Design an enzyme around this catalytic site. Structure first.
Site, short mmCIF file in Angstrom:
data_model
loop_
_atom_site.label_atom_id
_atom_site.label_comp_id
_atom_site.label_asym_id
_atom_site.label_seq_id
_atom_site.Cartn_x
_atom_site.Cartn_y
_atom_site.Cartn_z
N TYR B 120 -0.23 5.34 11.28
CA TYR B 120 -1.00 4.83 10.16
C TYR B 120 -0.43 3.48 9.76
O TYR B 120 0.79 3.28 9.77
CB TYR B 120 -0.97 5.79 8.97
CG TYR B 120 -1.72 5.27 7.75
CD1 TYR B 120 -1.12 4.41 6.85
CD2 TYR B 120 -3.04 5.65 7.51
CE1 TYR B 120 -1.80 3.94 5.74
CE2 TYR B 120 -3.73 5.18 6.41
CZ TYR B 120 -3.10 4.32 5.53
OH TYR B 120 -3.78 3.85 4.43
N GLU B 207 -7.05 -0.93 6.70
CA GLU B 207 -6.49 0.39 6.98
C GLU B 207 -6.78 0.75 8.43
O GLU B 207 -7.95 0.84 8.84
CB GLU B 207 -7.08 1.44 6.04
CG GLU B 207 -6.68 2.87 6.35
CD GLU B 207 -7.13 3.84 5.28
OE1 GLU B 207 -6.41 4.00 4.27
OE2 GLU B 207 -8.21 4.46 5.45
#
Ligand SMILES: Nc1ncnc2c1ncn2[C@@H]1O[C@H](COP(=O)(O)OP(=O)(O)O)[C@@H](O)[C@H]1O
Ligand SMILES: Nc1ncnc2c1ncn2[C@@H]1O[C@H](COP(=O)(O)OP(=O)(O)O)[C@@H](O)[C@H]1O
Ligand SMILES: [Cl-]
Ligand SMILES: [Mg+2]
Ligand SMILES: [Mg+2]
Ligand SMILES: [Mg+2]
Lengths: 231, 232
Positions: B120, B207
């Site tokens: 992530y 993101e």
């Protein structure tokens, strides 16, 4: 008379065969765009630029201006541009061409694949036997025929009914294939014969017919080169 | 406001990042043609069909008519057609959408790749610090979930708005995630590009969930964005 590699592979695909026809380009700019767009699907993949000329021995040939090889590996689209820029609009010199060379105005851009095995396979009308025949071998060497006749497998074909599943399943195992690759090879040889028969070809030559890995490492049969003659 | 996955990935690629933008299809018959043509370049490859909707949790969602998943693997172009035929013009239901679902009128057709690691990484505007910050982790857990159960797993990196990320900051973040060899510099170059996207496009969040290490068809390991979300 022959047709170019990428057209030959497209004809094979049309009849159910697996062949890397890539995409044809007539300029280095277009070759670059082809490789660039391919990075949208398999980022980081390498590329192979293959001169489309009606002559054999491209890999070991050389260009009138210095560059070596008609089949060259490329790491990026820009490398694809440079390589294609040396092929398109220039003269290639191989064994089959002599010193006269052969002009080139287009290439084939395709993705680099992991090759596990390379086979030879041809389909032709054998006058001596009076029927079509499927020739195949697993060697990488006519050379292999004289130094190792055991290596060559010749399969006479029913001039009326064509090949049989038994003939092809055996030829597959005679080349060293087992598991799912047996049926895969059977299906591909079937398609290749339909090309030979339905298109009234004088020769269908796959040099090499390969066992390759997919991006997810599945093993499959694939035509990596192709030559089809007519008239 | 957010933009669809494939639009975000195309923007990342424009700034030097590596992202699997695949190719968008606005009809099932087009989705099949894309997969079929891809077999000219990597014969035998599998495919992944990803619903393009402005909502998260596609992988574990389900469609109003039964089919499970907004991100589904397919073996052939015809399977791609069948899957796309259930997505395009139908309603997907995920956690973020509730029971009302969300409409889908286009999909992304990508080639299936071998994924080794999934990270992530986000770049958001921190107001307490008054500057951007890069959050990243190598764990597989929600992102806020991992933050509360293991805040040590999360790596926070304040970014100088005037100099952007520094090679020192990025080399450490790469190794803090477990990367070595060529993947270190590869990760550095990609995070640089991701910041240029965030900076030059005045984004509120970039993101990458997941930012992955994948294999190329010739088994080379490279950094690649497998998903992307950009807000404004
Ligand atoms: N997509 C590919 N990726 C990697 N290597 C390839 C690919 N296609 C062909 N090759 C390799 O390149 C060699 C040369 O190509 P080929 O089509 O056989 O030309 P030629 O017979 O004129 O030299 C092949 O024998 C094979 O080993
Ligand atoms: N090209 C691909 N090949 C194989 N798996 C993939 C590919 N792209 C994505 N995936 C997997 O599918 C999962 C779901 O896709 P993703 O883009 O993350 O959608 P979402 O997170 O919104 O559900 C990813 O976490 C990844 O593990
Ligand atoms: Cl096929
Ligand atoms: Mg050849
Ligand atoms: Mg995701
Ligand atoms: Mg692999």
């Amino acid at each position: 008379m022959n047709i170019h590699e990428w057209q030959s592979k497209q004809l094979i695909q049309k009849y159910g065969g697996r062949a890397q026809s890539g995409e044809v380009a007539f300029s280095p700019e277009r070759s670059r765009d082809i490789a660039k767009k391919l990075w949208n699907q398999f980022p980081g993949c390498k590329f192979v630029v293959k001169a489309q000329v009606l002559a054999g021995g491209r890999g070991k040939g050389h260009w009138e201006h210095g560059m070596q090889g008609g089949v060259k590996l490329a790491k990026t689209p820009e490398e694809v541009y440079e390589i294609a820029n040396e092929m398109i609009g220039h003269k290639l010199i191989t064994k089959q061409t002599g010193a006269k060379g052969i002009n080139c105005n287009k290439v084939m851009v395709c993705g680099a694949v992991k090759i596990l095995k390379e086979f030879y396979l041809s389909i032709l009308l054998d006058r001596a036997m009076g029927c079509p025949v499927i020739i195949a071998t697993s060697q990488g060497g006519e050379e292999v025929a004289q130094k190792c006749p055991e290596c060559l497998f010749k399969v006479p074909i029913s001039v009326k009914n064509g090949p049989t599943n038994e003939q092809l399943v055996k030829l597959a195992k005679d080349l060293g294939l087992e598991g799912d690759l047996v049926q895969d090879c059977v299906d591909n040889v079937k398609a290749l014969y339909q090309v030979f028969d339905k298109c009234d070809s004088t020769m269908v030559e796959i040099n090499p017919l390969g066992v390759i890995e997919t991006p997810t490492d599945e093993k499959v049969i694939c035509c990596l080169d192709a030559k089809i003659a007519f008239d």
